Structures are given as C-alpha cells and as structure tokens.
Design a protein around this nucleic acid. Structure first.
Ligand SMILES: [Zn+2]
Ligand SMILES: [Zn+2]
Lengths: 94, 37, 146, 82, 156, 177
RNA sequence: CCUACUUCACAAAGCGCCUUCCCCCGUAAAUGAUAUCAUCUCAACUUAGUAUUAUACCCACACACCCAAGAACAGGGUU
C-alpha cells in the first residue's frame, strides 16, 4: 500500500453521501459545497476548486474539470482527512 | 532654399529658425538668402 | 501678477500673487530648485513642480523672472515640453496617440525606414539627455535611446 | 507588524533562529480560504479541425493525422513512474 | 534636507522597518518553542529532507529511492545514516541548517538496496577529414539506496 | 495534497486566464508580461514540452502609449511577396489601421521562435477597447498589475496635494504672466 | 468583346469595338512662449492635410449525355 491511494485500494461510490454519513456519525451538520476557485468556466478545459464548509469552516477542497467532479473529489479529500489516510500522513514504521 | 551644411546669415534680416526638425535661414528682404540644413 | 482689462479703454490691475512657501530647506541657494533641494529629483511627470514656471496657456516663463539656473531652466523647459506632449497639462493649452518621454515634437520626426546594421543601428530617442544626471535608483542607468 | 511576505496566500510564514543561531526554524501553517471568499455552487475534415482549434485554442496542424511511420514509432507501453 | 514630494524625491520601493532586535529575539524564542512542542507532540506527518550525499543534494522522503553514481563499499541490505542533512521539512514547519543541521536534530537512515552497473555509455570522438575517430564504452558503477526513515528530535 | 491522481494532474496543469489593461501602458512591457504568461514561464512546473501556457486577455490595446517619438519613428515592414510589394508603415498608421497589430506583433516577437509560437498566440486575446466577450469575461481568473503606473495630470491632482506641494518661488507682483 | 469591318465563318482573332475611378507633404501661412517685441512649432498648437486605399469582385452545394468549361481532374446545363 506504499504509494497507493485510499480510494485506489478501497473502491467507493457516492463519496459525498459517505462523507455526509460520517459527519452525521460525528454529530456534525452536512457540509456546504462551495466554489472556492475556478478558471475557464466556459471553455473546454475548465478548472474548478470546490471546498466543503462545515459551519463556515473549510474541511477539504478538491479540484476537478466540472463542478460535480470537483465536489466529488473534495468529498474524497474530506474522507481521507477524516480517516487519517492523507497523502502527507506519517509513514508506516518498520 | 539652398541646402547648406553650415547656415550663415547673409544680411541683417536673415534669421535662424528650427522648423520641421531642421534649421532654416529665412529672409523677407532677400528671399535669395533662404537656406536649409 | 498684473492683468490687462478693457472696456475702448484699457488698464492694468495687479491681482493676488502666490508667495514662496516659508522655511526653504536650503536657504541661500542659487535657484529655487537648489533652495528646495530638487537639483536632480524631478521628472517630466512632476506637473506640480513644472506648472509653477508656466504661463497659463502652456508657455514657459523667462529665466530672469523664474530665477532658475541656466541648466535648471533648460531642464524645466524640456520636462514641460514632454509633459505637454504626454497630456499631463490639459488646462494649459493655447485656447489621438498616447505618449510620454517624447523628446521631439511629433510632427518633426521622420520614420526610421532603414535602421542600420547591429553596429550602426538608428535608435529612437527616449526622454531627454538634459535629465541624464537625475537620481537613478535602478541598477542600470536610464536608456535615452531605444 | 513587519511581515517578510504577504500572509494572505498559501501559508502564514514565521521565521526564527534557534538560541544557538545555527539553525533556522520556519513555521508555515497553511491558510484556509475564508467562506466569504467563495461562491455558491451553481445548479468534413476542414470544418472539424476549425471547430477543434477554436475549442482548444490550438492550431490546425496538430489535428491532422500522421503517417504509419510515426504511428508505429510511437511507444505504446511507455515506462510509468509513480 | 527636506525634499518636496516628487517622482524621484523618494526611492521607488516601499520603506521597510525591520522589527526591533529585542522583541524579534523574544518572538523567535516563542516560535522555536512552538515548533519544538509540535515535534515533541508528534504533530507532523511525512517528513522530507534535503540531504547532501555523494556530491549532490537529494530531496528525500521515507520509502524514496536514490541512485548514487558510484560504488559505496557497502554490502547490499546494509543500513546507513546520511549525515549531511541540509533541510528537514514537514507539512507545517521546516528547519534549515547553516549550512547543515545538527546530528541531534535529524536522523536520516537509508539502506543499500542494490549495487549495479550503469547501462553502457558511448563516448565517441570524431573530427572530419582527419582520420580521427574513436569509440569507448563505459559502465559507471551505481548503488541504489532506499531511504527508510527520517526522524527529528526536540533539540531546538 | 491528498487529491486523486487525475484531479491533481488536472489542477497542476490547468491553464489560467489573466487580464491585462493596456490603457497608457507600453506595448513592450505588456508584451513581456503576456509572453511570460503564454509560455508558462511564470509556473514552477514550466517546461517547453509540457504545453503549460496560459490565456492572456489584453484590453484597451487601442490606448497603449509609446515612449519617445516611437509613434512616428517605429516602422513595421512587411512584404506581400510580389515585386514592389514592400510595405513600410509607421506605428501610428498601423495603430489607426488595426488597433491590435502593435501589441500582437510585440508579443509575437517576444515569444520563442519555434513551432509553439502560433499555438501560444492562439491563447492571446487582444481587444481594442474596454468591451470583452462575455465568455472571455467569465473565463477570466486574475488581473495582472499594469507594468507602468500612469502619471497623474494636474486636472487629476487633488487640491490637498497641490497645497501640500510647496510654492517654489516668489513671482514678481508686476508681471503680466 | 464580336454588332459591324477585316483574317474568317456554327466559333477563334485584330487591323475592329467597349470600359478605365484616390491621395501622398517639398513647403506656404494663423496664434504663441522659451527670449512678455518677433518667431509656421524636433514648444504646446491652428490650416492647406490626406492612407486606416474607399470601395468594387467572389460568397448556396448531391450514371450518362451536351457545353460558350476543360490537357486530365474540375466546372455549367439536362424540365
Ligand atoms: Zn537676408
Ligand atoms: Zn541653482
């Protein structure tokens, strides 16, 4: 699993729904998806950054080609942060 | 006008004026003195 | 400043005239520029400085009246020409390409059809050589030719 | 109040020297995007090459095909890193 | 020496007033203490490090691979400590040596994962119309190292 | 960090839209900025083969300003290819004919002289006046600072600034002026 | 371009006929400072002074035979 990604190893569907479930378990209101940054919205190569905000607090933001894809990726990033499987997490100890 | 590298006033009424980028000697009394740099 | 008024009968009346600001930084200086420590510290765009030596219609004022040095009067005259050509004195006029630092009158310069070889290039003057000694805060000196 | 660089973007940088002065510590926590700085989520060959060039802001040249020579020189199993 | 405000009267750059040395030293002590407490509590994830090994500087992290272009006189699988660590950095803080960090601060450990020879490199000389043509093949020895761990200690 | 591979790559290599205002700005400095952005030399991930250029939208190109007498001295030379087809036109004439040619040519000359130059120019959008197409406006991301700070006119200077600036000399009272 | 004339003859030609439309700047002046006159101004500026050639032309588009279209291909017509 070194170099692998959390959802590369554990395939999931509806990461936004799964994140909503996790926040409900943690007794937290559903996150608000918001457009933090965007570029070339009307072009064929857009860049959208979508951040999920918990009571006006950013929990995770993700990039994408469309707003839906960016929101989905932001949900995945939020899930990674919640589960502690972030890319910059502590290495495994050998 | 006569083209001259060195402009010289020939009479009293000859006057030097820099116009359209270059010097000219104009003269009302003797228009013969007209010189252009 | 005296102004001539007609009604024909014509007479001259002296009106309010500005006075030099109190406490010059460098009293006992040759010209006003030196008195106020501006020897090499003004440019074509310093309209506040330049307009103080300008007739209401844009003409320069005589050196005898202004008290400026010969070199400082020349510098001010050139800077005023540049400011007029750049349009920084819209109110000082006799009665559409944006420019600045134009040394020559626009109507007296011919196009550079044949710029010479690299070693003998014909360069386009920029600014005025009279301001060559202005205070330079940049590593490289001002390029008077482009 | 002096700041080495604007603190608005990419992190809040704080430089320091250790007491011995032989190492430099930098504390740079990332700065989150304020909620107020965000917007709500909204809810023939010739003509074809012209359309593609307009779409992707490229030139026509890259949309024309290439010969078998190049198509077969191209490596179909390139090495992959990371 | 007053000068009226003209374009060239003042320098074109903003005036910067550096913090007074005493207050700045107190602030440095505060920041260093904060970072040291982060290290003590283990508030970091991946650590990277710029380490000067062989003759070059490598940006390194745990599990990384490094290809030294020479034999190291070490048995394969042997563990080593890389000692010239110029920089150690985390998500929220970085430590810079002047020019090297102390041994007590950082401990970068590697392992000789492989010893090999480089692919044949061709050295050809040629000069036209001189009958001058020479060819040589060189295989430089190489050692692959795997960086196992990067450790930091609260020694600031 | 923590992005998936494809979103991370897309974000890293996405092309941003920049806006330059050419009003009273030197076309050369505008072109330097635009050429850097078009090549992508403003990105740390830059590489000639990565196609990392960005979009640059320059407005008010009709209102650029040349230093010196360049409007009259600078000459743009072209040849139709036919005998007697050599055309030399001054900067002022070229500007009057095409209000975009000057900036377009400056950026073209500043770009690298290879096959990517015209692809880069395809990402350059020059508009003579303040009007910009709506799609381009929505695409815009950032506005670059104008390279040259426009000097103020007397008509623009505030009375407070005029008062602050000292009077330099005592004009003789008995003078016509 | 072929109505005449002519070479000639279901048409090609001239010796025949028809149509041909915009400037460029060298200087001459007005007002006016530096240099309170004066001064056409690589001073600001006002005219002769204009190019930023104005336009005109073309703009549709799926066998076989004929063609004023044509080397082939292509093009026009086939009601
Ligand atoms: Zn005479
Ligand atoms: Zn003096």
């Amino acid at each position: 699993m070194t170099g692998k990604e959390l959802f590369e190893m554990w395939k999931i569907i509806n990461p936004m729904g799964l994140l909503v479930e996790e926040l409900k378990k943690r007794n937290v209101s559903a996150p608000e998806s918001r457009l933090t940054r965007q570029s070339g919205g009307t072009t064929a190569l857009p860049l959208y950054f979508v951040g999920l905000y918990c009571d006006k607090k950013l929990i995770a933001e993700g990039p994408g080609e469309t707003v839906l894809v960016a929101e989905e990726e932001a949900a995945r990033v939020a899930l990674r942060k919640l589960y502690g499987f972030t890319e910059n997490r502590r290495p495994w100890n050998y | 006008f006569k083209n001259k590298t060195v402009l010289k006033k020939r009479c009293k009424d000859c006057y030097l004026v820099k116009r359209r980028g270059r010097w000219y000697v104009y003269c009302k009394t003797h228009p013969r003195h007209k010189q252009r740099q | 400043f005296r102004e001539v008024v007609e009604t024909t009968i014509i007479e001259g009346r002296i009106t309010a005239t500005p006075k030099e600001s109190p406490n010059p930084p460098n009293p006992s200086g040759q010209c006003p520029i030196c008195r106020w420590n501006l020897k090499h510290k003004y440019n074509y765009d310093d309209v506040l400085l330049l307009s103080q030596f300008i007739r209401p219609h844009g003409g320069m004022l005589p050196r005898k009246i202004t008290g400026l040095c010969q070199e400082e009067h020349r510098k001010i005259e050139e800077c005023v020409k540049m400011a007029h050509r750049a349009g920084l004195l819209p109110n000082h006029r006799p009665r559409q390409l944006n420019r600045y630092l134009t040394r020559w009158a626009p109507g007296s310069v011919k196009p550079i059809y044949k710029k010479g070889p690299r070693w003998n290039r014909v360069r386009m003057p920029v600014g005025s050589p009279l301001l060559r000694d202005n205070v330079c805060y940049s590593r490289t000196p001002w390029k008077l030719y482009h | 109040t002096y700041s080495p660089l604007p603190d608005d973007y990419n992190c809040n940088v704080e430089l320091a020297l250790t007491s011995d002065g032989r190492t430099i510590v930098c504390y740079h926590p990332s700065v989150d995007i304020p909620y107020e700085h965000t917007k709500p989520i909204p809810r023939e060959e010739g003509p074809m090459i012209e359309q593609l060039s307009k779409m992707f802001f490229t030139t026509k040249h890259r949309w024309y095909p290439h010969g078998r020579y190049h198509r077969c020189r191209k490596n179909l199993n390139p090495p992959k890193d990371r | 020496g007053y000068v009226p405000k003209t374009s060239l009267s003042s320098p074109p750059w903003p005036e910067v007033v550096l913090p007074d040395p005493v207050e700045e030293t107190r602030h440095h002590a505060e920041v260093v203490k904060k970072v040291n407490e982060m290290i003590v509590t283990g508030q970091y994830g991946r650590l990277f490090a710029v380490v000067h090994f062989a003759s070059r500087q490598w940006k390194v992290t745990s599990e990384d691979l490094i290809l030294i272009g020479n034999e190291l006189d070490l048995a394969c699988g042997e563990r080593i400590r890389l000692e010239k660590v110029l920089l150690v950095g985390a998500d929220n803080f970085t430590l810079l040596g002047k020019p090297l960090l102390g041994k007590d601060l950082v401990r970068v450990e590697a392992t000789v994962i492989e010893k090999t020879e480089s692919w044949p490199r061709i050295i050809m000389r040629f000069r036209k119309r001189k009958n001058f043509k020479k060819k040589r093949i060189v295989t430089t020895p190489q050692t692959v190292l795997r960086i196992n761990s990067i450790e930091i200690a609260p020694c600031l | 960090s923590s992005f998936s591979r494809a979103p991370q790559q897309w974000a890293t290599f996405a092309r941003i839209w920049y806006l330059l205002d050419g009003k009273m700005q030197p076309p050369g400095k505008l072109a330097a900025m635009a050429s850097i952005r078009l090549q992508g030399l403003h990105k740390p991930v830059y590489h000639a083969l990565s196609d990392c250029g960005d979009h640059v939208v320059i407005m008010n190109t009709r209102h650029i300003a040349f230093s010196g007498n360049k409007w009259e001295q600078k000459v743009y030379s072209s040849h139709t290819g036919y005998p007697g087809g050599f055309r030399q036109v001054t900067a002022a004439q070229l500007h009057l004919r095409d209000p975009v040619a000057i900036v377009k040519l400056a950026i073209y000359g500043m770009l690298p002289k290879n096959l990517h130059r015209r692809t880069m120019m395809e990402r350059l959008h020059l508009f003579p006046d303040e009007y910009i197409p709506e799609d381009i406006l929505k695409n815009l991301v950032e506005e670059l600072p104008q390279p040259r700070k426009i000097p103020k006119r007397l008509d623009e200077y505030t009375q407070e600034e005029i008062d602050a600036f000292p009077r330099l000399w005592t004009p003789p009272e008995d003078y016509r002026l």
